Predict the structure of Nucleoprotein.
Amino acid sequence: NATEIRASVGKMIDGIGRFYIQMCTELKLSDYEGRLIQNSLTIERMVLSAFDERRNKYLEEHPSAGKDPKKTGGPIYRRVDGKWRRELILYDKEEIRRIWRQANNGDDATAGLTHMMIWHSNLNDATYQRTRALVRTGMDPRMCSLMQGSTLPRRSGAAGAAVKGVGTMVMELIRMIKRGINDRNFWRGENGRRTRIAYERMCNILKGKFQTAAQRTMVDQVRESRNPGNAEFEDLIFLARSALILRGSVAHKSCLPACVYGSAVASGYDFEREGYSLVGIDPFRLLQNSQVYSLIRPNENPAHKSQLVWMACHSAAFEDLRVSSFIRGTKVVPRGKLSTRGVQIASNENMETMESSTLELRSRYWAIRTRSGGNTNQQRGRTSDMRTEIIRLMESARPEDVSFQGRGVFELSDEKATSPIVPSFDMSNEGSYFFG
Amino acid sequence: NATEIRASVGKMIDGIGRFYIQMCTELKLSDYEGRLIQNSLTIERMVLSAFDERRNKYLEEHPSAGKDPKKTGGPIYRRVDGKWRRELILYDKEEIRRIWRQANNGDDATAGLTHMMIWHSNLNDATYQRTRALVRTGMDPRMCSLMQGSTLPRRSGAAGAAVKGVGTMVMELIRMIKRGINDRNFWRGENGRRTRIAYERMCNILKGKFQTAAQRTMVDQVRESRNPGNAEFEDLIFLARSALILRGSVAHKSCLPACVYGSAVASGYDFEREGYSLVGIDPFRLLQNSQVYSLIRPNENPAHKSQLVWMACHSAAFEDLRVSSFIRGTKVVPRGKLSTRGVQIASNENMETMESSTLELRSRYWAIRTRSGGNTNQQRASSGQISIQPTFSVQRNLPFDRPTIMAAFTGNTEGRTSDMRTEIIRLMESARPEDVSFQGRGVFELSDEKATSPIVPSFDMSNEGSYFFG
Amino acid sequence: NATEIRASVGKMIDGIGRFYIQMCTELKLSDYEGRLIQNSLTIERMVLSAFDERRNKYLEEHPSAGKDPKKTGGPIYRRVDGKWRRELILYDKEEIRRIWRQANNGDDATAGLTHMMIWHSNLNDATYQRTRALVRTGMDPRMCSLMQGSTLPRRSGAAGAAVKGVGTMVMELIRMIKRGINDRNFWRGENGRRTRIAYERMCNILKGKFQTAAQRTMVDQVRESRNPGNAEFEDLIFLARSALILRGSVAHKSCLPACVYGSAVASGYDFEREGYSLVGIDPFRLLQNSQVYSLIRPNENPAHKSQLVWMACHSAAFEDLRVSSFIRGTKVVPRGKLSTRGVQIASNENMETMESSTLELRSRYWAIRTRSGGNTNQQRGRTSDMRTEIIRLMESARPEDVSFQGRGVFELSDEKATSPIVPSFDMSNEGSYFFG
Amino acid sequence: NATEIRASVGKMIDGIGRFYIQMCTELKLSDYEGRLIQNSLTIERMVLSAFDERRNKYLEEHPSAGKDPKKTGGPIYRRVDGKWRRELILYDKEEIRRIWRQANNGDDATAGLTHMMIWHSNLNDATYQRTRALVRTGMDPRMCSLMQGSTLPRRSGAAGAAVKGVGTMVMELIRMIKRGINDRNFWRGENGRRTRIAYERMCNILKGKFQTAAQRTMVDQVRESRNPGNAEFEDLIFLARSALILRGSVAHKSCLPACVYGSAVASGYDFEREGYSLVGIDPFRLLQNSQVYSLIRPNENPAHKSQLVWMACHSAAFEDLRVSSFIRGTKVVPRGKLSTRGVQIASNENMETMESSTLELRSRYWAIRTRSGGNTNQQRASSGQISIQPTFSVQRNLPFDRPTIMAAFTGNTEGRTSDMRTEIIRLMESARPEDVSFQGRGVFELSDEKATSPIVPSFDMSNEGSYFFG
RNA sequence: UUUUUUUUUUUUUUUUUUUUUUUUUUUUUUUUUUUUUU
RNA sequence: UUUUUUUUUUUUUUUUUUUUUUUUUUUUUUUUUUUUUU
């Protein structure tokens, strides 16, 4: 049944929106200031810093960074008669812990935590990707497309584990392998047993993510090495460059700004009654009547900022630019010529230059975002023997194979997925590559 | 965090200034004599000769040079009613060792040693550069600009290693290569292992100093030769003449005279409390209210001597003359027509001719001195995506950059790896004497403390000459 | 040249005897009490506890065992008019450190330390052998004969390393192997490097100890294992049971009681002038005119005690009983029917029962004790292939092969090794086995 | 060191005695009523029912037996002017949990729990032994002597595991084997893994309990069966009837009534200062000046009740009657003609017949109770040298014990390993009912404190009967 | 002519055992009573 | 119909580099002086 899942997610987002309402009440912010992305961003890093129970335990025994008992950051942006000012207001974790506890009807609301931390991962992937660490592990910078969910820490659950990319898992496992190579860390002690356990958990997440049998079997055989040394490093690099084309079935969770939920809940649109979905039309229509204000530099233009915000909201920064333009109805500029910077504001930037303006989120069309792979795969002793089939499959692969047969782009006016329209692009080589 | 580094350097310079105070107390010198550069210079060669533990061990087993048990030199200059007299006062190392130990609160203070020895290297580079050794190794005398930190011996640490120039490392490595060519010194013994170790330490210092990937890779491949013979000699000469334009990111440590620190500490300006920095405004403002006296020949003029002292203090002898003039506000005379000599006084020079006078160190402006490079190396292989991920479920093609996909996988036998000089040549051809560097940074005024608003300089004064030598 | 070695050992033993003279002066003991083995034994454990610089450093950071700042034990035995009384007199290390420093003319005298600690190892091997640890490592108790120098710690030098038995090294290496198996201790850290270094030092000591090429080569190949696991355990057990017959050339250092040296030095017999030797006639003739008193239980007999003391002095507890009887001239009782106990006295034993009496050390003959092996050996991919030659050599070995051709037992009256007498035993099967 | 163990046990028993003091304060009982065994017995079943965390968790999900939220039993006996009355006062666990927590200075005091539960096991073994379960598993009723610590559940730690008898472990393992035979319970699930783990823990407890190598090896080989079926049942029955004579080294923990500790603590005899021991003179001298009152039926005699109480206190119900009589100084009546019943009072017995009187615990002598075995197992394979080392350089043969040298090397295929019962039988035949044990140890007098001089007992009183049952 | 290195708790009651040795939970049992009965 | 684990120091000045980064000793040199001479 799907009604129970819809009711659960509706209750969750209703609690999130009511927490947004209460923070707006408590912060004494104006109506416009309650529609600012920066305030929600800072509040949600406060959120993660309050539920990072592992880091809370680590920092209680580590009193450093000066004035850091329980309070971090808090750069609240406020309006005086047109101008803007930031105040470093410090909030302790514990009261916000109870305000959450009262916001979800006595529950912890860890799932909502997973969705907010994933949405932060989505915005991070949209804005900046780290070839720095990618080459720190020595892997080439050609695979920036598989850094989805890279910023997500381990503390997230299965729902968080679903959206992390294959390359993110590759980086996380190579970190553990290099740590176990630097020092003899795999002893029979509890630490070795626990890192072992985390290793097979991440590995069966990996093998669940893939679709073709060959890569699943070679991941199975990579496990057979009780002592991860150097050979497994190139083995899993080969796995990664095979997943470049033999991509894993990774989900795309549609989370939206902290405000969008709050404005919807404030207006009285109860999500429990009519039901809510995370993959269907829902996050599209909530943005059809949503107003969002944002802060922009004197050199930054808002036109690219709105498109980057739509990237962050719908996690389409790793998709083809042509398709995103089709759903937008307007051309989406690649990152090569974006005359904009990161959404977050640096701690040293002055305030006389900063200017607030609206963001456009309306899209002409809507589409389903399933956790499936291209139809091209369906059309098609050690690790090297399977690398041979990897090579022959890569040779069989073509840049022409059309995927996603039987599905299409839909119009906004339809609610039950009745009749789609088939898109068709013949616009030469505009560039289906967000980076480069 | 940067507060801890500031506190550490403040404590270090406070200890240095207090040691200067105690030497002034012990030497029974007057107020004017405590503001003489020569006294600090001699005292600091005493300093290095007392912490040169390697040379101490070498000389204990080598009792030569006549009366040299523990005492060397010591030409202290003193005033009698206007006139000057030098006394060869000999100080043993050990008591000064304990006076240091009490001056840094029970610590050895080796970092301060590194900064004083670097400052001696700075003054040496400002005064005299050795094409003698540069052609002893046979390298042409055109590269005198890369002799920064040449006088620095190996005993300095990482902080000392940061400021040594690329050419200094080239000279040091060619010395070892020629020694290993003269005799079969790379045997499996401990000496060969230790010289090997020092070799890779100097080489990863080198590759850390560079910025572009091509030179970093060719330095990596130079390492692959287990037996350094003759080919590596021209290989690293090519490396050096490539670094002529593809310069390495070498730091510029701002050390000041032995007295300047002592006068500041004596007045009660504690550096631990307000914090201290080695790159920012700090050494500039301490010289804004510093008085320095110096010794000058009857033919030498003090006007060029003050500018040469500013060179030595701020290690700007290898920079453009126009920029140094802009910060000075007055024209800086190149070494071609400097009617002056070395700061240090020869052991045979008479004293009736010698005359003491003030030095000018005030500068109209101040600027940050980062360990970065210009901007003319970024035209080669660009980055970008190679694959795509389906976000929306739309019936569309999945664009794959296939010809690079084979390139990553491939699976054949590479021909060879020896043509990086070719990219060196093409980068040199791409380089122009017009490319402006250091975008987004500017020269600042003295009255500002937090780097608020700079002023952009602009020189159109023909070809006055941006070359300190020649 | 051999004169320099003789002069060095003579100077060393002269310093030792002068230290014995000064301890007799300082302790205010009588003439008889200066000829007691127990006093010298306690004083020499004080000696080792004062030069155990490693243990000194370990105990300074570990203030335990109640009153233990610098002083340990010290059960000095004294006579009142026939009866005996023990006093627990505590001496600190440091003053005895300087008294040594003045006793060896400003030198540390570490070699003398090695000889005293070896002589303690000799007495320990003579009295009690530990099958407890031998089966703690799981090795069978059949090899008690290779426990020579077992009590010797690592701190001894090359001279100490020469006399340690093959089985002692086997036990020491198995201890390190089991420690490295229990935890991942072979990391790239300094501890792993240092235990590695100690490992090859002990191994080339081992391969120096052996004589035949096959065992030297298999010890060389045992080294090739960078990770000592379980296979090397049985490999080196096979090495040990091969050394059972293919015995290693282990020296036998002839050290004598703390008093014997002191009495000789007190009488004015300077050893520097006439020269001294550790293998030749020397320790034999010094015992020809030496008087020794010892403490005996009311049930213990002195007849077996004197023979056990001769065992401890000449380290002949692992030799054939028949030969030791021949040099003695009297039958030597094996340990099976020795109605005696350990030489050292337990801390709880009462004093009214204890009785002091002389010990006999005179021997009818004298013999050289070289660090060579039996002449029987001269008559004759992995570890198992060499185990094959081990088995065939063992089969070629016979319990009849006579060894030590060209050498014989000598008389006391001869000084320059002129003419020996060939012994010949036909006394059935009296038993050439000290244990069992 | 032994001082730390003595201090720990002294602190533990001091906490126990202080808890007894506080229960006496809270229950408003008189001085005489505080010296009753029944009150302490009921209070200590309350104790075990409060720390039976496993049963607490099982009963919270199982609300049965009527009024049983947190309270069980509680038959407190009280005096009115000579007569006796029982009140069913119900106490919840949780407040007593905190009163313990405050009684042991913030600690849980689980060790004390182990000693009280062992002392309940001791009294149960003294009073009634279950041939009912012994024949439920089908084992003959001849082995009632190995039911020591039978009532002890698994929750006890290593200290509790030490005192459980061999037969108790045999019963516990046969229960698990029969459960695994009834249903396929050894699957790869967590339950199978955990019962497996408990199985090897109980088995290495077993092999630690034994002394001779043969039984230790056959227990090792019993483990090799991954699927415990029927053969292992008779295998371990043979193990048990071998342990009948080849007894295991099982300890005898000397616990005393709940009151005895309380009276000693109340008088101010701190056990931490002077030290306490569980095996030495200690529990003997505390009973030398201890007063105990008990409840007796109108038909029961107190003379046998005092002796049975001494049995329960010192766990001597499985020992020879003659020895217990010697330490007592009076004849100890075997259970065949004991005109008494169980110490605990049935829930339906009336109160007009019940009469309270003193108990005698004074003993003429004292003895150590070590966890060692007799002496009749040392006739088999002896040890000794196999090789020799040449000490003197003499022309002589090197004696080698060749036939054992092949035996150590060998290199063939062993026939089988299932004939250890054969050595069991031959050892049993070698065993005699005459072999005297415990050489070098004797019975001591009360006046001695440091184990100075014993007296050797000697019994020639025919066949009075060294068998408590039958 | 062959040599003083230190890494988290051991040992002289004694001669071939013993360990300074430890709070885990899985579907219904038991105090009318002492060797049967379900 | 698929899920909150914690182990010794990191990060919001910024968008693809830079590192919070460090006292080793091997057979005769150098302050008459600034680019030669041995």
About this structure: The radius of gyration of chain C is 23 Å. Residues 1-436 of chain C form one domain.
